[PDB]
Amino acid sequence: AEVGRLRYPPEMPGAEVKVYKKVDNVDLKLYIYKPADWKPADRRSAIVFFFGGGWQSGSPAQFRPQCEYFAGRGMVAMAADYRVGSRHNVKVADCVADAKSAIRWVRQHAAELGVDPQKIVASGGSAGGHLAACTVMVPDLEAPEEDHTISSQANAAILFNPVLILSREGLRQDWEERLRERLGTEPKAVSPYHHIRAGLPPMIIFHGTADNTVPFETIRLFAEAMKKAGNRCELVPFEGAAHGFFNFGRGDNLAYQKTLELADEFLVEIGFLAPKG
Ligand SMILES: [Cl-]
C-alpha cells in the first residue's frame, strides 16, 4: 500500500540527476547517490535499482532508502526511472530495453561516476527484479541509439521477489499469443528462467514463501536450475512473508534491515564491497 502511494516524479533528496536515455520524447533519469568521500578517479562498485509496479506504474523513490544505505557503504548507488504502461503506453520488452540502457550507460560513464565498470550490480523489486534479472541473463532484444561496443550485462544481481518465469514452455498456444501481445515480443525472450545457462553472473534472491503474486515455487525452480548450471544463485526464503515484504516502512522495517544485511554480505562474498570495519 505504502509503495503504491509514492510520488512520481520523486524528489530523491540528495541525489544527483542524470539523463541516461532519451526516447519517445521522455528523459529517463538516474538518481545517483555517492559516498561522502567520493572522488572522480575512484573505482567503486555500483548498484542500479529498478522499482516495481507490474511494468505499469511505480517510482524510483521505492529504492531511495536502499541507495542511501549502499552509498553509506562506499558504493555509487542509484535508482533508475524506466518507461511503464500507465505513463508511456509501453510493453515489458520496452522496460527491458530501458534497464539494459541504464546498465550500458553506467558502464559507458563509469570513469566520471567513479565506478569500476566490472562491478555494476542490477537490483529491483518484482517487475523491477525481473528487469534486473534480464540485464544479467537475457540477450538484448534491440539496439537503441547507444554505445553498442559497451555491454549491457550487469556483473551481479540482487533481486527482491522478482518475476522470473514469463513463458509456459518447458513447464497452450493461445496463452503464448496472448503473452506475446502483452510483452511486445516472444515470451521466452523476456523470461529469465528460459535463459539459464552456465557462466552467468552471481546473484542473491529474497522471496516470501506466502507470496500470492509471484509464487515462491517459480523462484525455487529458478534457483535450483541455476545451481545445476554451476551459477551462484543464493535464495533466501522469508517464511510466511507476502509480496513486497522487503520494503522500507513495512513490518517495523525488520525484513528491510535483514535483506540489506544479507545483500551486503553477498556483495562482500563476491568482492564488490570490503568487509564492514
Ligand atoms: Cl502476496
Three-state SS string over 42-93 comes to: CCEEEEEEECCCCCCCCCHHHHHHHHHHHHHCCCEEEEECCCCHHHHCCCHH
Resolved by: X-ray
Ligand 1 centroid, distance to 153 Cα (angstroms): 30
Report the alpha-carbon distance of residue 259 to residue 162 in Å, rounded: 14
CB count within 10 Å of CB 176 equals: 15
Residue 12 contacts residue 56 (beta carbons within 8 Å): no
Ligand 1 centroid, distance to 244 Cα (angstroms): 7
Residue 123 contacts residue 77 (beta carbons within 8 Å): no
Ligand 1 centroid, distance to 155 Cα (angstroms): 29
CB count within 10 Å of CB 191 equals: 24
Residue 239 contacts residue 270 (beta carbons within 8 Å): no
Copy the grid coordinates of residue 89. 503506453
Q: Which domains does the chain carry?
A: 1-277 (3.40.50.1820)
Report the alpha-carbon distance of residue 26 to residue 37 in Å, rounded: 33
Copy the grid coordinates of residue 189. 525472450
Ligand 1 centroid, distance to 91 Cα (angstroms): 23
Give the experimental resolution in Å.
1.8
Q: Count of alpha carbons within 13 Å of 181, Cβ hemisphere only?
A: 5
Report the alpha-carbon distance of residue 108 to residue 50 in Å, rounded: 19
12 Cβ contact partners less than 8 Å away, ≥ 6 residues apart: 31, 60, 61, 64, 79
